[PDB]
Amino acid sequence: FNCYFPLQSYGFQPTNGVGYQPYRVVVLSFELLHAPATVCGPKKSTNL
Amino acid sequence: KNIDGYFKIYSKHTPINLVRDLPQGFSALEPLVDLPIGINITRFQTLLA
């Protein structure tokens, strides 16, 4: 009694309205300028 | 070498004919590997077969 499961389910169905739908969210937690750069990427070169 | 978070491995291979000594002569070392690691290094050890 008054002892509920901590995990509760979503009502993900396509018939629900906007705001009740499954949303895939990704969070980027990249970090700055404290170690040698490991990914850089953006270089471009023109013709000779 | 280790400078500012970078490991530098510089090397050379040579064919040789000697008994138990190191020879006399000149040989440069070409740069081979740089690594951007970023850690403190104090001791080491090699490994044997």
Resolution in angstrom units: 3.9
Confirm or reject contact between B38 and chain A (CB < 8 A). Answer: yes
Task: Round the CA-based radius of gyration of chain B to a whole number and report it.
Answer: 15
Elucidated via: cryo-EM
**Alpha carbons B22 and A15: distance in angstroms, whole number:** 81
Binary contact (B5, A36; C-beta < 8 A): yes
Confirm or reject contact between B36 and chain A (CB < 8 A). Answer: yes
φ, ψ for residue B34 (rounded to 5)? -120, 140
Q: How far is CA A26 from CA A23, A45, B14, in A?
A: 10, 32, 53
Q: Which residues of A are less than 8 Å from B4 in CB distance?
A: 36
Could you tell me the sign of the dihedral formed by the alpha carbons of B34, B35, B40, B45, in that order?
negative
Which residues partner with B31 through β-bridges? Answer: B10
DSSP notation for A9-23:
-----TTS-TTSS--
CB atoms inside a 10 Å sphere around CB A36 = 13
Q: Residue B7, exposed/middle/buried by CB under 10 A (0-12, 13-18, 19+)?
A: middle
C-beta separation of A21 from A15 below 8 A: no
